[PDB]
């Protein structure tokens, strides 16, 4: 109803069981939807896209994310 407590996947418009490929593929698409040039409204929201895809772009960050995340 007001679910605002989900992980980085469900921020990024990919399911909680997306591959690293599905991340970077989706990321570009969403970037083009939310880019400040063509979306002055949602420019702050762009930051949540990066903040999610960041953790999900390094294999060591992902290693900990998968089983812990708060490190």
Curated annotation (Swiss-Prot):
> Where found, per UniProt?
Membrane; Cytoplasm; Microsome; Nucleus
Where is it made, tissue-wise?
Answer: Ubiquitous. Isoform 2 is highly expressed in testis and lung, but detected at low levels in thymus, prostate, colon and liver.
User: Could you tell me which residues carry N6-acetyllysine?
Assistant: 67
Q: Which domain of life is it from?
A: Eukaryota
**Induction conditions:** Up-regulated by heat shock.
Domain J residue range list: 7-69
Name the job this protein performs.
Answer: Co-chaperone for HSPA8/Hsc70. Stimulates ATP hydrolysis, but not the folding of unfolded proteins mediated by HSPA1A (in vitro). Plays a role in protein transport into mitochondria via its role as co-chaperone. Functions as a co-chaperone for HSPA1B and negatively regulates the translocation of BAX from the cytosol to mitochondria in response to cellular stress, thereby protecting cells against apoptosis. Promotes apoptosis in response to cellular stress mediated by exposure to anisomycin or UV.
What quaternary structure, including any partners, is listed in this protein's UniProt entry? Identified in a complex with HSPA1B and BAX. Interacts with RNF207.
Q: What protein does this entry describe?
A: DnaJ homolog subfamily A member 1
Give from-to of the shown chain within the full protein.
1 to 70 of 397
């Amino acid at each position: 109803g007001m679910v605002k407590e989900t992980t980085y996947y469900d921020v990024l418009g990919v399911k909680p069981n997306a591959t690293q490929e599905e991340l970077k593929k989706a990321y570009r698409k969403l970037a083009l939807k939310y880019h400040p040039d063509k979306n002055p409204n949602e420019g702050e929201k762009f930051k949540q896209i990066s903040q999610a895809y960041e953790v999900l772009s390094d294999a060591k960050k992902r290693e900990l994310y998968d089983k812990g995340g708060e490190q």
